[PDB]
Amino acid sequence: MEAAHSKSTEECLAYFGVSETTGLTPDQVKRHLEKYGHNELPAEEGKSLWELVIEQFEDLLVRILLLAACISFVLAWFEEGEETITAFVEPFVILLILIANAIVGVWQERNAENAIEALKEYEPEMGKVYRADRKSVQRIKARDIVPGDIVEVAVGDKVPADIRILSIKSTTLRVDQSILTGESVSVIKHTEPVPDPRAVNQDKKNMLFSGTNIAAGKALGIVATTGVSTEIGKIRDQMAATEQDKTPLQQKLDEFGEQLSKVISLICVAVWLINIGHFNDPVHGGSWIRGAIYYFKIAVALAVAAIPEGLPAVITTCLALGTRRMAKKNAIVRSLPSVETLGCTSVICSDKTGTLTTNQMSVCKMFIIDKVDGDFCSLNEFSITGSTYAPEGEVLKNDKPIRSGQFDGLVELATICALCNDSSLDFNETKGVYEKVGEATETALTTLVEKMNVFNTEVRNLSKVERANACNSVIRQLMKKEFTLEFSRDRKSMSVYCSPAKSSRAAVGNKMFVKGAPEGVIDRCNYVRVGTTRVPMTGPVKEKILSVIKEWGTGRDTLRCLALATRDTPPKREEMVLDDSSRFMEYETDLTFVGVVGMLDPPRKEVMGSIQLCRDAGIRVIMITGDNKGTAIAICRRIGIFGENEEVADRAYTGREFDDLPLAEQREACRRACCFARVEPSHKSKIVEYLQSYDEITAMTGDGVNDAPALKKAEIGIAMGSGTAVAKTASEMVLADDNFSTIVAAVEEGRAIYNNMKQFIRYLISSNVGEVVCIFLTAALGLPEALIPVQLLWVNLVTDGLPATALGFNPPDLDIMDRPPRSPKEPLISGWLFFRYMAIGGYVGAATVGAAAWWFMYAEDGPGVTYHQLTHFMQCTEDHPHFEGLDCEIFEAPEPMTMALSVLVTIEMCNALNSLSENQSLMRMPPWVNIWLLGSICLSMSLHFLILYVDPLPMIFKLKALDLTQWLMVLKISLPVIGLDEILKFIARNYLEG
Numbered sequence: 001m002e003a004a005h006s007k008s009t010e011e012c013l014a015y016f017g018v019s020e021t022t023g024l025t026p027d028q029v030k031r032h033l034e035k036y037g038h039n040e041l042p043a044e045e046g047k048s049l050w051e052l053v054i055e056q057f058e059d060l061l062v063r064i065l066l067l068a069a070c071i072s073f074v075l076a077w078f079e080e081g082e083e084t085i086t087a088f089v090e091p092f093v094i095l096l097i098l099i100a101n102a103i104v105g106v107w108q109e110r111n112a113e114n115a116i117e118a119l120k121e122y123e124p125e126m127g128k129v130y131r132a133d134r135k136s137v138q139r140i141k142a143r144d145i146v147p148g149d150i151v152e153v154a155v156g157d158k159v160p161a162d163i164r165i166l167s168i169k170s171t172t173l174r175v176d177q178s179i180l181t182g183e184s185v186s187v188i189k190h191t192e193p194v195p196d197p198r199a200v201n202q203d204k205k206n207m208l209f210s211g212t213n214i215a216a217g218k219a220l221g222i223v224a225t226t227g228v229s230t231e232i233g234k235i236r237d238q239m240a241a242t243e244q245d246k247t248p249l250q251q252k253l254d255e256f257g258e259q260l261s262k263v264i265s266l267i268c269v270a271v272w273l274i275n276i277g278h279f280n281d282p283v284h285g286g287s288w289i290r291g292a293i294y295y296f297k298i299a300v301a302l303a304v305a306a307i308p309e310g311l312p313a314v315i316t317t318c319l320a321l322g323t324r325r326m327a328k329k330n331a332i333v334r335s336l337p338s339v340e341t342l343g344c345t346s347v348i349c350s351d352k353t354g355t356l357t358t359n360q361m362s363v364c365k366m367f368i369i370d371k372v373d374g375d376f377c378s379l380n381e382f383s384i385t386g387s388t389y390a391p392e393g394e395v396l397k398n399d400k401p402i403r404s405g406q407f408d409g410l411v412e413l414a415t416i417c418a419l420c421n422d423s424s425l426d427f428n429e430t431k432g433v434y435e436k437v438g439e440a441t442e443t444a445l446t447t448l449v450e451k452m453n454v455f456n457t458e459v460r461n462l463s464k465v466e467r468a469n470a471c472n473s474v475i476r477q478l479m480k481k482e483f484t485l486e487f488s489r490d491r492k493s494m495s496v497y498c499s500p501a502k503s504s505r506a507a508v509g510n511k512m513f514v515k516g517a518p519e520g521v522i523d524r525c526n527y528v529r530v531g532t533t534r535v536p537m538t539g540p541v542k543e544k545i546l547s548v549i550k551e552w553g554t555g556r557d558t559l560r561c562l563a564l565a566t567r568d569t570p571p572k573r574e575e576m577v578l579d580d581s582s583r584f585m586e587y588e589t590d591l592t593f594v595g596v597v598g599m600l601d602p603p604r605k606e607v608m609g610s611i612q613l614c615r616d617a618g619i620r621v622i623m624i625t626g627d628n629k630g631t632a633i634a635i636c637r638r639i640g641i642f643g644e645n646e647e648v649a650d651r652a653y654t655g656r657e658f659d660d661l662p663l664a665e666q667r668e669a670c671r672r673a674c675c676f677a678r679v680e681p682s683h684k685s686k687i688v689e690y691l692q693s694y695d696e697i698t699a700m701t702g703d704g705v706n707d708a709p710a711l712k713k714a715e716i717g718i719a720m721g722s723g724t725a726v727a728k729t730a731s732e733m734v735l736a737d738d739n740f741s742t743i744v745a746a747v748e749e750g751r752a753i754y755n756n757m758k759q760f761i762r763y764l765i766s767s768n769v770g771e772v773v774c775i776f777l778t779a780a781l782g783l784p785e786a787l788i789p790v791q792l793l794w795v796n797l798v799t800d801g802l803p804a805t806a807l808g809f810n811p812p813d814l815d816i817m818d819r820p821p822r823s824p825k826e827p828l829i830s831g832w833l834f835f836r837y838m839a840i841g842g843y844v845g846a847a848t849v850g851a852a853a854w855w856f857m858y859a860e861d862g863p864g865v866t867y868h869q870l871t872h873f874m875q876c877t878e879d880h881p882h883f884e885g886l887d888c889e890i891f892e893a894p895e896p897m898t899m900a901l902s903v904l905v906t907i908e909m910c911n912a913l914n915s916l917s918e919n920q921s922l923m924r925m926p927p928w929v930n931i932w933l934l935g936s937i938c939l940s941m942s943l944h945f946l947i948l949y950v951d952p953l954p955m956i957f958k959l960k961a962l963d964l965t966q967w968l969m970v971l972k973i974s975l976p977v978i979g980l981d982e983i984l985k986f987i988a989r990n991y992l993e994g
């Protein structure tokens, strides 16, 4: 049953043909259950199985590196050698890294909390119904309840489905719908029907929602919807139906993986293509397959040379280290990758109360009527000092303190504020400060009653523990509050019937002290109280009152005003039937205006600043409030979101307004909007959606299942520290202190971690730009094989893997926040940088192979080896350069290799330094600035010797401790990389592409 809330309990019972007394017949149940199904959210999947694994090994790069193993295992099996400790290395070092980055990948012991899971935690397990098969209140399984059957709920119960209350048995029923919105103040329910076919959950006063728990009372009603067909289930589906796109970085690392996987095999073609000589000469000898292994031993080398198997380790390190660094600033980042996107954040959507503000209501100003006459009436305005909840402050008129009670009206003023209040003030002993008890507003009202003290009641000689509510009580003693008509968004007001306590002498029968939003209440006043007398409400007057209410709510002192009025001659206790909600309005007419009070929820002392920061950062911030458009706009000028005098006719919309705008006009409004007031439920999702139709990285603030969809949807959802678990499990970041400022901080932080990430990323892969180049020369022109496949691994996980991580601590460049937000579609490497990293990548390919080519020929090893022909013959079947001797064993010995690798590890250390900036030389960017970089460079070479001296290592690496004479060449062969660098890096001046 869809709009059960708009039907009468009758129309509603009839819709299903059920007796409020008998129940659903066993048939109807099975029958109904076949039609609607089980009152349960659909189940999910995702646990320990073969899936996680196989998908783990589905990635390209992890495959190309697995294929190298599916070949190295056999390649390092046919290889001739008495060694059995260096053979099963390659097929293991890889097969190890593959399985290593598969555990820390299938690691779901931490990151495994889904938002839809908690959603099932809000739906109870059992519920009580009334079928026709048993006259007893059978407590069946919740899962078996069905639209149509009449259920029972009583205190403490968790509502099993969406029911349409039929009959309330208790005095009054109160449920805790916080689960949905968050304002943990339980609400009264009624049986009267909400006729508006499209009321919003908050206004469906005659309905219980599944997930909600009953605060007070006990009622019986007829279930309207179960399963996904419910407010909770509906929210579930929206989330189920939303799929977040992959983050920008993760999107590049894939683009790379693809363009790479192609270029890798693209070079395997050049090999079998450059072989134009091997097609003829090669005769008998069985080398058909014995010589073809050369085409395989180059793949499991060319491949591992272009795959930075150390990146998915560094980026995670730098990231995990940022998570903590941000946690220190109160920003808890759940999703890791997010630290990247949080930097491309272009729009911040924040709620006002308790994020942009403190949620510290306090009454500042208030007034009553002074004199009414000749259509020209005046007023008496006061101000109140004290922004705390502590009854510590004074009431002053004309900047000077006055005795609130010397003023007849200010009395009744204070009277209403106390008897028309469902709250109290409490001094917390332990802590040592008065705290609110309930609605933060009404408390501010209570605190006013104290500060005021219209009856002069002694309070100096009292205890902070019993003085907090002294004056209020005094007033509760002169009037007996019988019953009270709760607030409603229709009448925007809320009265409270009172009776004259026997212990009095001023009893004008009964009274009704009304208090609500100025407009409504004031419009229902036929009179105005001028002191003690009463006089007809006249236009001029109403004109004057509304006048001052308009100034306080839109002025420079953003105030929330409440009209205070009363009914002098209230309807007879008999003529009133409390159960009739919508009827309350009438019971509150023929009123008498008494006064107004304007309170303030101060914007947080640090927000005014951050809003500015977001300006310099080019980040657009959108405040979402509950204030009325008019005051929203003020608070906005106030906190900086708008100029002190900017045009905002079209930049701020109310929810109603935004609804009267057709799709085109709505979207077109989200790209300029900065303030939304009284926005409707869906709207958060709507807005997010629109902001995105502009490729905008949007941050959304919220809490409660209510806002789960939007948090999921938005690029960066932001739950509050005090928020629901679901709202937290749905967001990407949780604000430890629910403060706006900490969102901006975290944005900047996450904006630095990329600037540094972008470095070690274009560095750790810049070396791979060479390793392949090297391998191409070391395979194209001759086979002076300088870089072993099982040797490059250690050079990518430590040799350069250490300076990378060290690069994850580079000094944050100034003005970080004085530039517009990055572009999720900005490639790390391209343009002048493409050509830059091009040379530096080929040059390191002329350096590595050269340590073995430039060597033989000018070295102190080989008097007649210079200008050799390692290109012509390699198999060595005869002797031309050397007749009878033992020289055809140099093609496989630690001599030309142990020289290249060293140079490699030398040019990289200079390239790491070339990776501290992108324009400023090392002269302006002292390579000793990043203290943690040097601390790694040293631990880099400190391990280079360890695999060159300590025998157990230098052997398995095919290297040997180079003489300090021949090791002096590693300098003038590597060291000059910085020149080419510094050249291209100093040439970015004429090329104003940076």
Ligand SMILES: C/C=C(/C)C(=O)O[C@H]1C(C)=C2[C@H]([C@@H]1OC(=O)CCCCCCC)[C@@](C)(OC(C)=O)C[C@H](OC(=O)CCC)[C@@]1(O)[C@H]2OC(=O)[C@@]1(C)O
Pocket: 252, 253, 255, 256, 257, 259, 260, 263, 305, 306, 307, 765, 768, 769, 770, 772, 773, 827, 828, 829, 830, 833, 834, 835, 837, 838, 841
């Ligand atoms: C891994 C190692 C190597 C050496 C490789 O071939 O990487 C290429 C490649 C895949 C790209 C290129 C490299 O291009 C070549 O080497 C082309 C052949 C040159 C022959 C010249 C003979 C005189 C990157 C490396 O290099 C330079 C130096 O410009 C930059 C960049 O990479 C990134 O931005 C990735 C970061 C996530 C990518 O253009 C990228 O392709 C993309 O889609 C990107 C966006 O990925």
